[PDB]
Specification:
InterPro entries: GFP, GFP-related, Green_fluorescent_prot
Family: Belongs to the GFP family.
Pfam families: GFP (PF01353)
Bound molecules: trideuteriooxidanium
Strand content: over 45%
Number of helices: 1
GO biological process, one term: bioluminescence
Strand order of the largest sheet: 1-2-3-11-10-7-8-9-4-5-6
Protein name: Green fluorescent protein
Helix content: under 10%
CATH topology: Green Fluorescent Protein
CATH superfamily: Green fluorescent protein
Oligomer: monomer
CATH architecture: Beta Barrel
Length: 225
């Protein structure tokens, strides 16, 4: 029951190992979260093989404990409730008319630092599709993330669409199916149905020559009066 761990600014570390259609890569990220304001600031670096997929396709994979829950909705905040021991976050992300990512992550504290450790596996991508062909714009839309309690175990089920702008003016849809379960065996907050309203802004540091992404993100829970 870790809501109180998030009242201040919390350092964040993200570590991802990925394989998409046999193309192996890794990403490290650092920054900080201020859940009081629903706020994230992170910088990510691609650290091994050439990144085989567009940065925007990794945003959702690369810490929903930093969402701002309104006071009246605090009983619905599963994510913070599982801390400090943490939660497993698992997804399948279906890119319309293309491949899928399957991800497994553990989100937990290591001392003062909120860590997201991820393995990502992508299969069934098209060689010259929007993903492997790097045809997605370097930007990010605003989404609604729908959350419900898991009725069969101590967790949540989450579903949402993201829309990734394509360089030709079109849109690449990504349908996300997600499950979160506590790592510990203690109680968690099982929510009524609600959603998170998200927005993200992607940028680059002109002085950073490694392949990287700077992210500023704001997320607020909503849907319960
Ligand atoms: O790191």
């Amino acid at each position: 029951m870790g809501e109180e761990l998030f009242t201040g600014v919390v350092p964040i570390l993200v570590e991802l190992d990925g394989d998409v259609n046999g193309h192996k890569f890794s990403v490290s990220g650092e920054g900080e979260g201020d859940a009081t304001y629903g706020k994230l600031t992170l910088k990510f670096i691609s650290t091994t093989g050439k990144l085989p997929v567009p940065w925007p396709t990794l945003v959702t994979t690369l810490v929903q404990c930093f969402s701002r829950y309104p006071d009246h909705m605090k009983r619905h905040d599963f994510f913070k409730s599982a801390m400090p021991e943490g939660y497993v976050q698992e997804r399948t992300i279906f890119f319309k008319d293309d491949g899928n990512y399957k991800t497994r992550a553990e989100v937990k504290f290591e001392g003062d630092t909120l860590v997201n450790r991820i393995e990502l596996k992508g299969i069934d991508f098209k060689e010259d599709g929007n993903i492997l062909g790097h045809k997605l714009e370097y930007n990010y839309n605003s989404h609604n993330v729908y959350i419900m309690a898991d009725k069969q175990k101590q967790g949540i089920k989450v579903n949402f669409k993201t829309r990734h702008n394509i360089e030709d003016g079109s849109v690449q849809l990504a349908d996300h199916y997600q499950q979160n379960t506590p790592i510990g065996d203690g109680p968690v907050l099982l929510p009524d149905n609600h959603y998170l309203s998200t927005q993200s802004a992607l940028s680059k540091d002109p002085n950073e020559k490694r392949d990287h992404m700077v992210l500023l993100e704001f997320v607020t829970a909503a849907g319960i009066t």
